[PDB]
Design a protein around this ligand. Structure first.
Ligand code: HEM
Ligand SMILES: COc1cc(C=O)ccc1O
Length: 402
């Protein structure tokens, strides 16, 4: 409908999944708020527009259409008002910094060592499947009370939920172009129910220190628990992004450090630089790249576009984190980039609830990896491909050493 952006009519879903950065570089220059036809939504591409929409009193949370098809109601990312306040109060206790500091090291460090012990003397590894994803899901899985769910299964679940959640392509009429692409999401949810329903049965009668047991019990009147149908969509929120993103973050940080070998050496020599390395990794390839959204609650003007009430806007934080109005040569990883705010954890009342936990998981994992394999080198015989528009990370990370 906007004549000068008619080229957007020819942008494809596959192009956005394989490499969104060229289209979004054009968006940041041409139309920081733009309707992208294949996504069927306005998209915010710049840091200023993303932060404004995420913090605006004239917007509230909404799930993307394929995200809502995948999670249903009430997913913590998609609700507001009293329901959102309750779900935030439900998830926040185990994520409080003072609480995380009590146990995070005894949680993640033995897990990192266990996975490292399986390959640290091999001279070769694929770090996404052998280290980053397992440490991420095993840490969170244990925290949640899913100790008896294998890391293989947790990784399978987040991969299926990922593809269903981001099955965003629509046709001329705004209908999903790939309706069959939700089926594996439905299959994942059905498997999750068969595993987690007996655990919830047990936690209702015998609460313990698992996070999901506390989601059932915390803040409730005596003898009551939150209904499982009320909490399952937030369980799915965790079983996708909370399981997937710390692994994406550490893998992307490693890819960035490999691209700057002098800086990889710096960090191996001085592991106190790992937090700064991770912060730049999250900016450089944001794990949650364009998965969240808001909806206007009143008519509002953003980036010169007059939006009616009820207008969804996708927040492409991964593009916002390459805003050249903020950063110099953002496409390059640079450990020594001057520390600035970034949007990889979002903004506003729906900003990431697990920042402190997530940074610790990534930090400890990289600490133990560099301790165990200080001469880590990237297998330059194999390339690193990134995939994903909603959630983005490297599909593999082949390394060698010795
Ligand atoms: C590097 C890892 C992670 C990244 C980059 C990340 C990023 C994000 C982003 C971008 C959002 C949406 C914010 C917005 O819409 O403005 C979000 C929401 C959320 N994240 Fe994180 N996340 C990570 C890990 C985690 C972990 C490990 C947990 C839980 C232990 C978690 C819990 C949540 C929750 C509960 C929300 C929903 C908040 C709400 O809607 O009120 N995240 N995250
Ligand atoms: C923290 O987990 C999630 C976060 C988001 C943010 O947009 C979307 C789906 C998720 O599962």
């Amino acid at each position: 409908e906007r004549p000068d952006l008619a080229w957007l009519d020819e942008v494809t879903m596959t192009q956005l999944e394989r490499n969104p950065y060229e289209v979004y570089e054009r968006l940041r220059a041409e139309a920081p708020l733009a309707f992208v036809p294949v996504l069927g939504s306005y998209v915010a591409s710049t840091a200023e527009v993303c932060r404004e929409v995420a913090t605006s009193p004239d917007f509230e949370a909404v799930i993307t259409p394929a995200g809502g098809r995948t999670f249903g109601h009430p997913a913590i990312i998609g609700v507001n008002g009293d329901i959102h306040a309750d779900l935030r109060s439900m998830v926040e206790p185990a994520l409080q910094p003072a609480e995380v500091d009590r146990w995070i090291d005894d949680l993640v460090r033995p897990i990192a060592r266990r996975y490292l012990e399986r390959f640290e003397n091999d001279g070769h590894a694929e770090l996404v499947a052998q280290y980053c994803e397992p440490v991420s899901v095993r840490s969170l899985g244990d925290l949640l009370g899913l100790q008896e769910v294998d890391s293989d299964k947790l990784r399978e679940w987040f991969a299926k939920l990922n593809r269903s959640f981001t099955n965003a392509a629509v046709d001329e009429n705004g209908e999903f172009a790939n309706p069959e692409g939700f089926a594996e999401g439905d299959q994942a949810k059905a498997e999750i129910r068969a595993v987690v329903d007996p655990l919830i049965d047990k936690w209702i009668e015998h609460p313990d220190d698992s996070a999901i047991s506390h989601w059932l019990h915390d803040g409730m009147p005596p003898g009551q628990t939150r209904d499982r149908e009320y909490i399952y969509p937030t369980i799915y929120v965790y079983l996708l992004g909370a399981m997937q993103e710390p692994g994406h973050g550490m893998a992307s940080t490693l890819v960035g450090l490999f691209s700057r070998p002098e800086q990889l050496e710096e960090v191996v020599d001085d592991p106190t630089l790992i937090p700064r390395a991770i912060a730049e990794g999250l900016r450089w390839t944001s794990p949650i790249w364009s998965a969240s959204a808001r909806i206007s609650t009143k008519p509002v003007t953003i980036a010169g576009v007059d939006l009616p009430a009820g207008t969804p806007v996708m927040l492409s934080y991964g593009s916002a984190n390459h805003d050249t109005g903020k950063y110099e040569a953002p496409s390059q990883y640079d450990l020594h980039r001057p520390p600035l705010p970034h949007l990889a954890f979002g903004a506003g009342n729906h900003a990431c609830a697990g920042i402190y936990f997530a940074n610790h998981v990534m930090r400890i994992a990289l600490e133990e990896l560099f301790e165990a394999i200080p001469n880590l080198e990237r297998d330059t015989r194999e390339g690193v491909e990134f995939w994903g528009w909603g959630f983005r990370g490297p599909t593999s990370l082949h390394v060698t050493w010795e």
